[PDB]
């Protein structure tokens with residue numbers, strides 16, 4: 001069946017449907033709406049779609065119902081199994097998409113997962129990019145994300161106006177999976193920079209240092225410090241970036257390391273620390289709460 005017009009003209013071939021309105025996906029999709037690309041959203045929990053519906057965005061009943069109405073599906077759900085559900089479940093994207101639709105997975109998983117998604121989608125005539133991001137919740141909100149992309153370079157170029165609505169530095173990394181590859185390098189760094197900050201703070205507190213001055217001196221400076229030290233000092237342990245998601249990222253890091261015969265003892269330790277945090281019931285706190293939960 002064909003369908004009625006929506007927010008974005010069909011002849012643009014740039015109608016976007018966005019799946020996963022979380023800490024990242026809400027602000028990202030809002031930036032796409034402000035830029036005139038957002039036609040539709042889907043979220044597993046319907047309440048989060050409310051602010052979109054109040055701006056006229058179509059609220060889909062399933063990923064399939066979203067896919068049949070758009071040219072580009074952006075996915076920003078938690079983990080690779082969640083991407084599998086939204087793409088390939090009973091009412092997943094593949095049940096609604098027409099050939100030539102592009103899926104862009106902006107969530108974090110792995111090169112191997114990116115390649116599997118692309119392979120499976122190509123059987124339906126659906127294109128794929130892996131385009132994970134860095135910059136945190138604050139970057140999402142500000143529209144300044146760094147976006148690292150794998151897949152056909154021609155599709156990277158075609159979608160650059162969409163990426164520029166959400167981010168600032170848009171980097172083409174190579175074939176399918178090279179965006180996830182970059183993102184997993186990035187997550188090694190983020191994890192250990194976060195452990196750095198937390199251990200520094202634990203030592204500073206034990207020594208009874210003036211936190212104002214600690215923050216001044218450390219702002220040693222890193223991403224984690226700039227994004228999360230103010231929250232941490234106020235005891236705001238909310239994400240931010242959930243500990244369970246970093247655990248997940250570090251699992252893929254260590255799988256890739258093992259596949260390639262590289263030893264990453266720091267990443268192994270980080271994985272252990274974040275694994276304990278999830279076991280202890282703090283998986284939904286931000287990563288900056290490590291050591292403090």
Ligand SMILES: NC(=O)c1ccc[n+]([C@@H]2O[C@H](COP(=O)([O-])OP(=O)(O)OC[C@H]3O[C@@H](n4cnc5c(N)ncnc54)[C@H](OP(=O)(O)O)[C@@H]3O)[C@@H](O)[C@H]2O)c1
Nearest residue numbers: 020021022023024044045077078082107108136137241245
């Ligand atoms: N937060 C950060 O700083 C940050 C930065 C860069 C990249 N990332 C990555 O971006 C991705 C999203 O992160 P986030 O911080 O936005 O996570 P989040 O706040 O936990 O949101 C997760 C989103 O995924 C949806 N979801 C999860 N499982 C699903 C399933 N099986 N089916 C359908 N929807 C599902 C959730 O739906 P509900 O609303 O129903 O729960 C929610 O919309 C993750 O891969 C994360 O690692 C995060």
